[PDB]
Amino acid sequence: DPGRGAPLAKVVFRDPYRFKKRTELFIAAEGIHTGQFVYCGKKAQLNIG
Amino acid sequence: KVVNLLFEKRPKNFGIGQDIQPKRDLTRFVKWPRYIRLQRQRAILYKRLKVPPTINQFTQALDRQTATQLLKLTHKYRPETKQEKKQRLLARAEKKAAGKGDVPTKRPPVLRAGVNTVTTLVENKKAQLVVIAHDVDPIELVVFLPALCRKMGVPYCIIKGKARLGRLVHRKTCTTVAFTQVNSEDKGALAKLVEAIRTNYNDRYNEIRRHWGGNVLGPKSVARITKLEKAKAKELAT
Amino acid sequence: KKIRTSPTFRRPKTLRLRRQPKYPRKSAPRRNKLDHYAIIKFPLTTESAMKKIEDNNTLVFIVDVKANKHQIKQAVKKLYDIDVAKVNTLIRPDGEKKAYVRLAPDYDALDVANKIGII
Amino acid sequence: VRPKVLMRLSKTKKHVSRAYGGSMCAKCVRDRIKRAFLIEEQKIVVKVLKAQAQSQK
RNA sequence: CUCCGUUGCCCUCGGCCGAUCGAAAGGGAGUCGGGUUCAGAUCCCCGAAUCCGGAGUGGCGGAGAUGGGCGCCGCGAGGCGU
RNA sequence: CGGGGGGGCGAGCCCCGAGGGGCUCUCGCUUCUGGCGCCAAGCGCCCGGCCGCGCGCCGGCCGGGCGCGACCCGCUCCGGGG
Ligand SMILES: [Mg+2]
Ligand SMILES: [Mg+2]
């Protein structure tokens, strides 16, 4: 993303609720490889991304 | 086997992230437009705040058992409809110039409708009963009336529905109503209500006049504040 | 109990009626001003137009400037009981719309010149 | 070919005749196949191991 | 009034994202040889083309699509019943 | 969401009869792999027609409708201040 030191990452989840696919833009944590599943939320496990 | 083997089950599971969620009713998770949101949280404030006695009395009201006798009683007694009016005049025009007519008849006793009609004939002690609607919009217009009614010693009462009170008199709405006289035969039922009403109203005033009526929180807040008194009870009741 | 599946309120779609006007709002309908005598003003008789009639089976017309081709076509047809293959319009520097009208092959320009009086 | 041109062309010029034909590139379909086993099968292997964990417990 | 069309209402489904303008150089389907004028020419004409839209009643071909089985009758090509 | 209430695989405690019950937790169930996942199956309960038994909420055929599935109630659309 121009004018910005960090690279972004597009991460496609899917809407838990409408048949579709929400996509977002997380600031890439270092070690985000492409092809990672990224777990999100309260019960999520403690690792990178 | 009257059961073709193919029709199976395919039972879905809507846990988080499992199969996609179905359609619940959401009426609390929906976007209530600016009239609704607003009218919704008038009714809330109007319980949340500490409401005054004079405005409280406009909650406590009659019950089915009493109300329905009242609205029975009035139904002998509603002021002449239009059309029904015309033949009161038209019949006297034919009866005058035919078979005698001094033409006072006897004006049969009827209701009395509006406020600045009622309040005069309450300030004149010319009323057996007064019915007042609770929900009246500027409450201004009927704040006093109870106070006034009990000072004159006139049985007042607070019925639900300015609509159904304003349906006796043939209109959209009405705030007050009154029986000044009654038909002789119909006086046992009137004096039956009157004594039943004013045990419950006119002879209460220092219970009504000093009862603030809101100061009630939200059940979400109450459930939490009470859940801390099971913490504080069960700290040193155990 | 007609449950809300969606968490928006969208306005209810109401009935909405059709104009049933109590009068007409102007008395009469305006008389049509682009006619089969008005849309064509005059045929040209310029040498580069006689040359165009005789050689290309056309007729060169000055035409009312708000005219379309399907108006110029159902004009020229209506009048010089003709029929028209295609119309082809420009605006002279002067504001006069020309329109040179190819007439179907069965049918001659050099005759229909003398009928309309040009030549 | 420039995309509006596709409207002129015939169906068969725009795909190849398969699953995910003309959107996906063989090499990824034939992994999408044999991924779509092994996701499916190893829900069955976890399904029975779960069933044996609750039969034990 | 067949069937189709059209409309009326009743039920059913639809996230969006901003009333609108902004390219003669950005995005944007499809036209080119030859001929022709004093001046115009992918413009006119001759011939070759091409895109978009319409084609309903469907204009006409071709695909869908023309097996197999079983059972008879026929020399056999074959015919019929299912 | 907050309360409530189902569930129940399971843990603590309490009870217990050893069947089980209560209170507490937990869940509310998707983590090895660029895989698939909507418009509902299943059960239930009804009604229209049509066909068969003939008593026809018996049975078939055709065609619909509602309940659970997908706990119930509310009073602030969720969050943070004050
Ligand atoms: Mg524009
Ligand atoms: Mg351009």
What distance in Å separates the CA atoms of residue C101 and residue C84, rounded to the nearest whole number?
7
Asked if residues B20 and A19 have their Cβ atoms less than 8 Å apart, the reply is yes
What distance in Å separates the CA atoms of residue B149 and residue B136, rounded to the nearest whole number?
17
HEC sequence for C86-113: ECCEEECCCCCEEEEEEECCCCCHHHHH
The overall longest dimension of chain C from CA atoms, in Å, is 86
Residues 1-49 of A with CB under 8 A from B: 16-19
Helix (H, G, I), strand (E, B) or coil at B123: helix
Helix (H, G, I), strand (E, B) or coil at D57: coil
Phi, psi of B48 (to 5 degrees): -70, -40
What distance in Å separates the CA atoms of residue C19 and residue C13, rounded to the nearest whole number?
19
Angle at A16 between CA A14 and CA A17, to 5 degrees: 120
Burial group, residue B111, by CB count within 10 angstroms (0-12, 13-18, 19+): middle
Q: Do the chains contact at B21 and A19, CB–CB below 8 Å?
A: no
Integer CA distances (angstroms), A6 to A33, A35, A37, B233, in order: 14, 19, 20, 54
Q: Do the chains contact at B16 and A19, CB–CB below 8 Å?
A: no
Crossing angle (nearest 10°) for helices B187-200 and B64-74: 140
Which nucleotide's C1' is closest to A22 (Cα)?
Answer: E15
Residues 18-47 of B with CB under 8 A from C: 23-27, 29-33, 36
What distance in Å separates the CA atoms of residue B156 and residue C10, rounded to the nearest whole number?
45
Q: Which residue has the tokens 């005033």?
A: B205
Asked if residues B155 and B128 have their Cβ atoms less than 8 Å apart, the reply is yes
What distance in Å separates the CA atoms of residue C32 and residue C37, rounded to the nearest whole number?
12
What distance in Å separates the CA atoms of residue B5 and residue B170, rounded to the nearest whole number?
68
Asked if residues B184 and B108 have their Cβ atoms less than 8 Å apart, the reply is no
Residue B179: DSSP 8-state: E
Angle at D14 between CA D11 and CA D16, to 5 degrees: 95
Alpha carbon B75 to its chain's center: 18
What distance in Å separates the CA atoms of residue B176 and residue B165, rounded to the nearest whole number?
8
Lookup: tokens for B76: 């002998």
> How many whole angstroms from C65 Cα to the centroid of ligand 2?
30
Asked if residues A13 and A30 have their Cβ atoms less than 8 Å apart, the reply is no
Residue C6: DSSP 8-state: S
Method underlying the structure: cryo-EM
- In angstroms, the first-to-last Cα distance of chain C is 86
Distance of residue B9 Cα from the nearest chain A Cα, in angstroms: 22
Closest residue by Cα to residue B214 from B39, B45, B41:
B45
**Phi/psi class of residue C116: alpha, beta or left (left: φ > 0; alpha: ψ in -120 to 50)?**
alpha
